[PDB]
């Protein structure tokens, strides 16, 4: 339990940190205007995992 | 003068976004997070 928490948490930061740099998530904010729940869902999903 | 020159300014905008990406996020979290706590003395004291 102690180590599993250390694993899942580290993975998500590795993903969200690299997800913003790529143009996929970058182009969203030039047109949509905001996240649209991407960060909210990501954080929400992390709890479920 | 016509093609390359404007692109240089265009690169700056796409090259400057990676910093504004996080400032609004961090401010929007703490600002919204702090608003969750009560403000009234009666309600706040009841929490204690």
């Amino acid at each position: 339990i102690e180590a599993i928490h250390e694993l899942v948490k580290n993975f998500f930061q590795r993903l969200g940190d690299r997800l913003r740099k790529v143009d996929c998530y970058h182009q969203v904010y030039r047109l949509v205007g905001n996240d649209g729940g991407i960060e909210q869902l990501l954080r929400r999903a992390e709890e479920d995992i | 003068a016509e093609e390359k020159y404007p692109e240089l300014f265009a690169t700056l905008a796409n090259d400057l976004q990676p910093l504004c990406i996080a400032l609004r996020q961090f401010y929007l979290e703490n600002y919204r997070q702090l608003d969750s706590q009560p403000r009234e003395i009666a309600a706040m004291k009841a929490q204690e």
């Binding site: 904010y29 030039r30 205007g33 905001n34 | 404007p6 300014f9 265009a10 905008a13 796409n14 400057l16 976004q17 504004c20 609004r24 401010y27 929007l28 600002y31 919204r32």
Partner: peptide, 21 residues
Amino acid sequence: SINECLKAMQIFEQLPVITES
């Protein structure tokens, strides 16, 4: 101001902050 100046040549604009609620 940044978007206002860059608006003169390109449509690549950043995000505003409003109605945070």
